[PDB]
Amino acid sequence: GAMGSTNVLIIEDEPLISMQLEDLVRSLGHDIAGTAATRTQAQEAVAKEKPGLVLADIQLADGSSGIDAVEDILGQFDVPVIFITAYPERLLTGDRPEPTYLVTKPFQESTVRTTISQALFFQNSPTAV
């Protein structure tokens, strides 16, 4: 990495997907800031360490929405978030704004590696509305 190993927050209840994302993002030369199966664990992760990139699904273990977890984090930081989930359509349910980065489950590592590189290309420096 040129900007250093950017630690990533992975919000995913499914362990096989979490560790997949962990290894995947690790292959990209990044790190893991924490793993969260729930929105609560997500906030605790953040309470511990600030991630430079966030990953979240829709359905969490607690029944909470990963989007809400993301927005919570976004209420703390202005960091790039990538939504990888089996419910792309759920983010398009009259919500109006569309997720900046979206990948559908099951994902292709090629797409994921691509998406991370984009999210971290457009580093969140300006103040977007």
TrEMBL record:
All copies of domain Response regulatory, residue ranges: 7-120
Domain of life according to the entry: Bacteria
Residues where 4-aspartylphosphate is found: 57
Protein name, as recorded: Response regulator
Source organism (scientific name): Erythrobacter litoralis (strain HTCC2594)
Portion held of the full protein: 142 to 266 of 266
